[PDB]
Amino acid sequence: GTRIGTLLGWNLLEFPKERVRELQSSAEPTEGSYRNIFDALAHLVEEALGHIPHGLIGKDNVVMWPGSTGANFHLPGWRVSDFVRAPSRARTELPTSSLTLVKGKKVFGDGIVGIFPPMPEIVPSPNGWAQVRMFSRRGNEIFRAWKGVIVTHPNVKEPLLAFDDGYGVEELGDVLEIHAILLQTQFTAEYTVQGLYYQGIPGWWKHLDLDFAFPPEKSRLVEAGAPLELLYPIAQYLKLKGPNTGFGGILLSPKILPFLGLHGLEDGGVLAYTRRWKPGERVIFNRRPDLPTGQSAVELTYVGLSPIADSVIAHEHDIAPTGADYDGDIGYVFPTPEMGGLYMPFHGEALHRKDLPTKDYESGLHRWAGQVHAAHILGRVEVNTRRLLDAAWANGEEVSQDYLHAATEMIQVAVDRQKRDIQWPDFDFKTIKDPVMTDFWRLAVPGGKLTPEGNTPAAKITNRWRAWETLDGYVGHPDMKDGLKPLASKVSRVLARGEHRRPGPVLAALAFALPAPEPRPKEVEDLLTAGLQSGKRHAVYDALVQMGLPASQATDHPELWLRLASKEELEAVFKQLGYRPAMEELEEALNAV
Amino acid sequence: HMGTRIGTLLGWNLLEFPKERVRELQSSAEPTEGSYRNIFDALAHLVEEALGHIPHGLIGKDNVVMWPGSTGANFHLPGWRVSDFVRAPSRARTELPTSSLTLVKGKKVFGDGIVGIFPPMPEIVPSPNGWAQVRMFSRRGNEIFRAWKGVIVTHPNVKEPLLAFDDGYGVEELGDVLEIHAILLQTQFTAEYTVQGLYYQGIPGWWKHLDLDFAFPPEKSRLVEAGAPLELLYPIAQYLKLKGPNTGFGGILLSPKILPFLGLHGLEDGGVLAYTRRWKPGERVIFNRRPDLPTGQSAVELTYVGLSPIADSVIAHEHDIAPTGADYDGDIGYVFPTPEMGGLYMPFHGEALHRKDLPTKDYESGLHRWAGQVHAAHILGRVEVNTRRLLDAAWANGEEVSQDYLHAATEMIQVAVDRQKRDIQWPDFDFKTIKDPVMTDFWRLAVPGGKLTPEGNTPAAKITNRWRAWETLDGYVGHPDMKDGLKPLASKVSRVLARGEHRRPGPVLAALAFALPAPEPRPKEVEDLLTAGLQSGKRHAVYDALVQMGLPASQATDHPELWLRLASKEELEAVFKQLGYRPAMEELEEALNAV
Ligand SMILES: [Mg+2]
Ligand SMILES: [Mg+2]
């Protein structure tokens, strides 16, 4: 996994994470505010490179350009962005002579670019898929390029490609180069804050609970009855959970089914790679982002199994309001309210405006600009709207549906502006002069996912979960705040139970209790010495884990040792020191008075 | 790193005593009952401390000891025996249900040391027609009832897992798994004349046929091949070795008794099969099984009668190779040309001295055995060195050691080797000694161990000295013509040493630092290891890790020593051309070929 553009010989700047984010917060839905961030970005590239390098494109912080090591794209400069920046997690090659060029726009469904026979060097299943970027190539010439997903089935004899969904010019290279940018997988399917704000069942907050998430190293300690001291700080292992969990697959069109040699699918109906539902059962389909109207959740019928693994098949017409396409979108399927779900199906009228004045961007920098600008406005509308629902619910009221539609319209023009220069719709931002429950959730659940990504350091995670103490100081729904109190209690006992249980004494103890280390190579003696004498124990410990050092040879390095020991070795030494299993302690804290 | 002892996979604990109070404790040991009982004493007293009791089940060899304790599988056989099963590296593991096995009866049925004839088993043997030297156990829980030591072979024509029941140790009762540990993986073995070999059966004037060569480990070999400067090979002594006029063939040693079980016909008396086309059916070859014994009885003429059905192997009759001492429990068989065709070993025509039925009792414990082993290991060495030493005093006048005496040394050796399992009564032996600088004394310096292929790593300071020993030949008493013949070789060695004496690597390493472009961007963990090494002066350890974890070269260019180890053939050639180095191999050639 390094980037597709690099393998095509492209330059790669990586501007400071912070320098764009500051520049952004001067962004408004105005032509000027664009030309603003446009100007400021121009002279951010110039004060790093000296010049405006020909054919440059950018995402956030990342900028990219060919130089002349860089393979040439036979397509508008700004389009090229979609192709270069993605990781190349796996590669393959096909001679242009093997391909059937099935013709038609959106033949396979709008997003799917190839229906192939098994290809186990990009898709790990016969029944599989991969999200890809694919080019038809000369030597340094790239004539046509496809972005989207390809599927794979035994019944498929010859590789088929949706030619008219390509990007370059008519003529075609002599080899088709395919880069898997995302390997086949299911996706974790949990309710989100946005989702719950926009379409949650009445009193949905009532159904949130605390849970524990241990990475496999730590989960081994927990399973063997490691003392709670070894889990400090317990906050880094906390997460919220919903009353239940969804299914999440890549999203495919029924248009593929004929080419798989299979019959199609009724209107109002869904297939997915799971037996969790019986054919005929209703389910809630969801595609993200959740939009303020609540329109990202629709009720559809589970009609049976998908023939492609890790996928949901649904008609374009059935999921149109949710904004779904087939070029990498994930479909999530949740239980309906009646059978315990937290998302309510959308029943309102949806379909927003047909067209606004639209120019392309003038270059790829123009695009990068628009992108950066738009991204801010997106967040603005998002947060503002959520805040407004806070004030509204506080004041016994509700945000009028017309306004949610207006917000929704801004959000999706924002998303479209990652692509083309589109005129913003008119939209008043109300602004709130109070701390609202939304502000709490941005603290407690940054990004809205109940699954955190534990980059945030030990220092800060405890503060995050300590925020649960300050509910009263936030304005929002009376019943939300009051309903959330038992959960804040639970959080609180768990935190308190671990507050002063530090690991250092247990690490010291294990050093004394464990026997002297068995004989080990001098390269190991030497690494461990190197680590200790310089304060890089952790790098060394990571190395020895990777190089596969055995536990018996690590007993003078308790932290290392804990990472190599077996279940039996851990159990044994914990018994010796007579530690109370952390989980027993944690359960008691959860259940307590 | 992974590869760990079968014992430790079984739950057994382990200690390593220093190489000091083993080479110290033993080095006062005599062919007497009491010399044993005082090596046993100071051992049982050396496990006294460094541990609590003397743990029960305890076994050992040299400076290493192991015991079951809390876990550790419990073996349903004599404690002392178990030594032979728990000590070896488990290089690969496999499991068969006890209902899959067919059990063939009679001792030595597949030949003495072969324990299984099996269908292809790709978990332990790479070749469909392969082998592996194994310990296998029949298992319950921590219950190990019966265990086999020896070789298993593998052939497509074997349909059912065939196993030599009555060769195993323990009780007739059988667990439900058969657990197999491959302790040596199918390989050919490197086949070269040894010093002891040439002392004991060397062609007349054999020393005349030794020469200088280079052995570069792959890392250095990459360098040399890309024309690294001689500076980067310092000290060149660590790459020197002696070489024969020719090389042998070396394979695992199997009994023709296996052939019926592969659906094949057996083998004529006096014949060998081997996995090589280097000989034609008809041709004579010298068969050699180590250790080379003083009688000369470890080399015997046999006829090559065709291919072995099994890869990397030699097949010959217990019958025909029994003077050599060989059986099949992992014994290697070596096959060299006959004298007529350039061989340096001479075939033995004589009576083999293999005395039978002198008082034999067991060891009582397994610490007894350990004691026995350490005790014996020394007596063995002294006899072996003593006997070679006398050959020097003798050829020095113009005499021979009396063949009778060679016979007695041999029988002494054989008992040493046997005393490693059982408490066997020592033979009467006379240690007629010389004290003088003898040529054996030199060989033990220039070629420690006897084997022309040096033992891996000895400190770089000392290795230059060892090859310097060739200066001091005259200091040494023995065969005139040996001493005199070797002069051009002692010269060759000396030219080569001198060609590289003061070409140190420091300067070249500093140049590569400057010549190479700035390192590409590297993960923090890489940055961290590199500073760790730097700050503590342990960079070589750090480099070993990064090599092992597979860092790319473009990221290591500030650490030339590391860089040299990651770089491609093309990348090396390139910087060497830039710095204008003269290829080392050219200079090394010149040093060889000069008047
Ligand atoms: Mg999309
Ligand atoms: Mg043997």
Domains of chain A: 89-184 (no CATH), 247-255+267-339 (2.40.40.20), 358-480 (no CATH)
Long-range contacts formed by A477-481: CB under 8 A, 24+ apart:
A477/A205, A477/A390, A477/A393, A477/A394, A477/A437, A478/A393, A478/A394, A479/A203, A480/A205, A480/A393, A480/A437, A481/A437
Give the type of residue at B13.
N
Q: DSSP secondary-structure letter at A138?
A: S
CA atoms within 13 A on the CB side of B429: 27
Kind of pairing, strands B13-16 and B64-67?
Answer: antiparallel
Alpha carbons B284 and B302: distance in angstroms, whole number: 6
Cα(A312)–Cα(A329) distance, rounded to whole angstroms? 10
Q: B204: which DSSP letter? A: T
Q: Which residue of B has its CA nearest to A538?
A: B525
Q: Is the Cβ pair B529, A549 closer than 8 Å?
A: no
* DSSP assigned state of A421: E
Task: Report CA dihedral (A29, A32, A33, A35) to the nearest 10 degrees.
Answer: 130
> In angstroms, rounded to a whole number, what is the distance separating the alpha carbons of residues B444 and B464?
15
Establish how many alpha carbons lie within 13 A of residue A86's alpha carbon, considering only the half-sphere containing its beta carbon: 21
For B542, name the nearest residue in chain A, comparing CA atoms only.
A527
Residue A478 and residue A388: Cα distance in Å, rounded?
Answer: 15
Cross-chain CB nearest to B549 (options A522, A529, A547):
A547
What is the C-alpha separation between B89 and B5, in angstroms, rounded? 4
Q: Do A518 and B549 touch (CB under 8 A)?
A: no
Residue ranges of A for the binding site for Mg(2+)? 325, 327, 329
Q: How far apart are CA B567 and CA B588, in angstroms?
A: 23
Of A257, A216, A215, give the one whose Cα is nearest residue A239: A215
Spatial distance between the Cα atoms of B531 and B395, rounded to a whole number of angstroms: 60
What was the elucidation method? Answer: X-ray
CA A422 to chain centre: 26
Bind-site residues of A: 325, 327, 329
Residue A244, SS3?
coil
- Would you give the distance in Å from CA B212 to the centre of its chain? 22
B528 contact residues in A (CB cutoff 8 A): 536, 538-539
Backbone angles phi, psi at A255, to 5 degrees: -60, -20
CB nearest B541 (choices: A523, A548, A568): A523
Altogether, the residues listed in chain A come to a count of 593
Compute the distance between CA of residue A251 and CA of residue A269 in angstroms, rounded to an integer: 13
Span from the CA of B84 to the centroid of ligand 1 (angstroms): 66
Which ligand has the shortest distance to the CA of B290? 2
Give the number of residues written for chain B.
Answer: 595
Contact A373, A419 (CB under 8 A): no
The span from the CA of B390 to the CA of B199, in Å, is 11
Classify residue B344 by its DSSP letter.
Answer: S
- Selection from A421, A417, A342 nearest residue A376 by Cα: A417
DSSP B145-164: EEEEEEEEEE-TT--S-EEE
Ligand nearest to C-alpha A323 = 1
Enumerate residues 6+ apart whose C-beta is below 8 A from B528: A536, A538, A539
Burial B40-51 (b: 16+ CB within 10 A, else e): beebbeebeeee
Q: How large is the angle between the packed helices B584-592 and B487-499, nearest 10 degrees?
A: 150
- B327 labeled part of a ligand binding site: yes
Q: Do A546 and B549 touch (CB under 8 A)?
A: yes
Which of B8, B15, B528, B559 is the best residue to mutate to test the A interface, defined by the most A CB atoms within 10 Å of its own CB?
A: B528
Exposure string of B357-377, with b = 16+ CB inside 10 Å and e = fewer, is eeeeeebebbbbbbbbbbbbb
CA of B379 from ligand 1 middle (Å) equals 81
Q: Which position has the token pair 């760790």?
A: B532
SS3 per residue for B484-500: HHCHHHHHHHHHHHHHC
The token duo for B206 is 């054999």
Quick count: other Cβ atoms within 10 Å of Cβ B445?
16
Quick check: helix, strand or coil at residue B459? coil
Interface residues of A toward B, Cβ cutoff 8 Å, are 515, 518-519, 521-524, 526-527, 529-531, 533-534, 536, 538-540, 542-543, 546-550, 552, 568
Residues of B with CB below 8 A from A550's CB? Answer: 1-2, 4, 8
User: Is the distance from CB of B129 to CB of B310 less than 8 angstroms?
Assistant: yes
Q: Would you say A409 and A70 are in contact if contact means Cβ atoms under 8 Å apart? A: no
State the Rg of chain B over Cα. Answer: 27
For residue B157, how many other CB atoms are within 10 A of its CB?
A: 13
Q: Give the HSE-up count for residue A504: Cα atoms under 13 Å, Cβ half-sphere.
A: 2
Contacts of A540 in chain B (CB under 8 A): 529, 532
Residue B45 distance to chain A (closest CA, Å):
20
What gap in Å lies between CA B203 and CA B189, rounded to an integer? 23
The CA distances from residue A335 to A186, A240, A330, A465, in Å, are 17, 19, 17, 29
**Resolution in A for the shown PDB structure?**
2.7
Please provide residue A30's backbone torsions phi and psi, each rounded to the nearest 5 degrees: -120, 145
| Chain B neighbors of A549, CB-CB under 8 A | 1
Amino acid at A133: R
Residue among A518, A538, A548 minimizing CB distance to B1: A548
Query: What six digits make up the tokens of B32?
Result: 């007497």
Could you give the CA distance from residue A84 to residue A6 in angstroms, rounded to a whole number? 8
- State how far residue B246 is from chain A, nearest Cα, in angstroms: 35
| CA nearest to A503, candidates A458, A544, A468 | A458
